[PDB]
A paper describes a structure:
We report here the immunogenicity in rhesus macaques and CH103 CD4-binding site bnAb UCA KI mice of sequential Env immunogens derived from the CH505 [name]-1-infected individual who made the CH103 bnAb lineage. In macaques, vaccine-induced nAbs  had epitopes overlapping that of CH103, bound only open trimers, and neutralized rare tier 2 viruses. The antibody clonal lineage most similar to CH103 we identified was an IGHV4-J, CH505 differential-binding clonal lineage ([name]) with autologous tier 1, and heterologous tier 1 and weak tier 2 neutralization activities derived from memory B cells of RM-5556 immunized with additive CH505 Envs. [name] lineage mAbs did not neutralize tier 2 CH505 TF, neutralized 7% of a panel of 199 [name]-1 primary isolates, and blocked the binding of CH103 lineage Ab (CH106) to CH505 TF gp120.
[name] lineage antibodies, [name].1 and [name].2, were isolated from blood memory B cells after four and six immunizations, respectively. For comparison, we found that the [name] lineage antibodies bound natively glycosylated and glycan-deleted CH505 TF gp120 Envs equally well, but did not neutralize [name]-1 pseudoviruses bearing these Envs nor bound free N-glycans.
Author numbering:
A (entry chain L): 3 to 6, 8 to 27, 27A, 27B, 27C, 28 to 95, 95A, 96 to 106, ...
B (entry chain H): 2 to 35, 35A, 36 to 52, 52A, 53 to 82, 82A, 82B, 82C, ...
């Protein structure tokens, strides 16, 4: 296919170049390499076309070039926004179209942010169906790694826990959520339940009670 | 100029995946390439094929060619994708995209306008509609809705029929060991507004026709 580095890691403010190695039947047969940016939740976004042209709306910071069968995307002045997957692609003689394998760009040096934690008890109507789901919502943290601990009357709860992989919010911090699935009997059998979120060595805890 | 994918969000293994793209703000019969592109969640973009608007000729990804059909309909202004004998490898967000160009023999073409994408899950698992539970509620208070145990993705949530957007946070779904999804949506509101303003989450899980507007009130 078209070959890209799988990962590139840089720091805020710095510049990065992503390569894209094809063949003389695509990148070296046309001036027709394009580049796409992809964030989760949005269609891919066209950044560069005809090797180096920018469509309106794409910043000055993005540029493209090629040399022989390898195309290159350079992004200058890296911001938190630029963290995304980047794909090159090209028409291929004489009839098909091929994407590069993609490059995950990580931008380091972003500000640390501690999570906010919101914990809800089960609803009345769920309880009436003899179930009880506790919902621990975790938001506005960076970097995107947390450890969640559930407790019942101060004792550790391992069963019934499911926790999401963190994903980026629009404000470029992370969110995640943790669900403790119990029966209503279980819920009523304790004085309280706690959700404890540990982020970079610091812990934020919330408690609910029947 | 706009494109919009539609089709079933769930297809059983070995069956045929079908999708349609509705194009607005331009004739499909014009000198454009009309393309199908997909992306399995967590994996790379893959061109499926194209149909050329002016003459109707098709070109397909060689690794898919035997299973792929692309058609177009000049009236309705649509083109569509048929992908036969699917497997879990075919689970992906499917996009339609316009391919524009200058000269092609010198420049090939590129995708300038894209649809929003439609997730298609290939699975033999049953569709299952969620239960929708209120998450009942200081100067400020968080309240929400739990959308519990559904399949497949996605579910949409808005608040007060789309008039309340400030302070809304809808969380990505958890996938439980059961194979069922759950998600929550929360809005933070002034506490003084409670008892005055009504808060309703508008939940839609189209595969199961679960369409619920749930009022969220402080527990009594």
């Amino acid at each position: 296919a078209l070959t890209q580095p799988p990962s590139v890691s840089k720091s805020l403010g710095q510049s990065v170049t992503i390569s894209c190695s094809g063949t003389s039947s695509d990148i070296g047969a046309y001036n027709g390499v394009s580049w796409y940016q992809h964030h989760s939740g949005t269609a891919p976004r066209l950044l560069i076309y005809e090797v180096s042209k920018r469509p309106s709306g794409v910043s000055d910071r993005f540029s493209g070039s090629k040399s022989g069968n390898t195309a290159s995307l350079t992004i200058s002045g890296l911001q938190a926004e630029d963290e995304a997957d980047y794909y090159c692609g090209s028409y291929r003689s004489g009839s098909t179209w091929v994407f590069g394998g993609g490059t995950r760009l990580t931008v380091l040096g972003q500000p640390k942010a501690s999570p906010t934690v919101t914990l809800f008890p089960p609803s009345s109507e769920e309880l009436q169906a003899n179930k009880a789901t506790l919902v621990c919502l975790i938001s506005d943290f960076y970097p995107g790694v947390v450890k969640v601990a559930w407790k019942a009357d101060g004792s550790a709860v391992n069963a019934g826990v499911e926790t999401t992989t963190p994903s980026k919010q629009s404000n470029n911090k992370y969110a995640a959520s943790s669900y403790l699935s119990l029966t209503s009997d279980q819920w009523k059998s304790h004085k309280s339940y706690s959700c404890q979120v540990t982020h970079e060595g610091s812990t934020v805890e919330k408690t609910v009670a029947p | 100029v706009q494109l919009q994918e539609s089709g079933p969000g769930l297809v059983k293994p070995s069956e045929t995946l079908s999708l349609t793209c509705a194009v607005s703000g331009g004739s499909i019969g014009d000198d454009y390439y009309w393309n199908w592109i997909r992306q399995p969640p967590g994996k790379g973009l893959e061109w499926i094929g194209s149909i050329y608007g002016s003459f109707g000729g098709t070109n397909y990804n060689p690794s898919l060619k035997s299973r792929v059909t692309i058609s177009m309909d000049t009236s309705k202004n649509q083109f569509s994708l048929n992908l036969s004998s699917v497997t879990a490898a075919d689970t992906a967000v499917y996009y339609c995209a316009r391919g524009s160009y200058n000269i092609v023999v010198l420049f090939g073409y590129y995708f300038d306008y894209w649809g929003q994408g439609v997730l298609v899950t290939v699975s033999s698992a049953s569709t299952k509609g969620p239960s929708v539970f209120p998450l009942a509620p200081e100067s400020t208070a968080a309240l929400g809705c739990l959308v519990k145990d559904y399949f497949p993705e996605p579910v949409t949530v808005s608040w007060n029929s789309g008039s309340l957007t400030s302070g809304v946070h809808t969380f990505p779904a958890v996938l439980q060991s059961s194979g069922l999804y759950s998600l929550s949506s929360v809005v933070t509101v002034p506490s003084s507004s409670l008892g005055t303003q009504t808060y309703v989450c508008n939940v839609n899980h189209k595969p199961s026709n679960t369409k619920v507007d749930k009022r969220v009130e402080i527990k009594t």
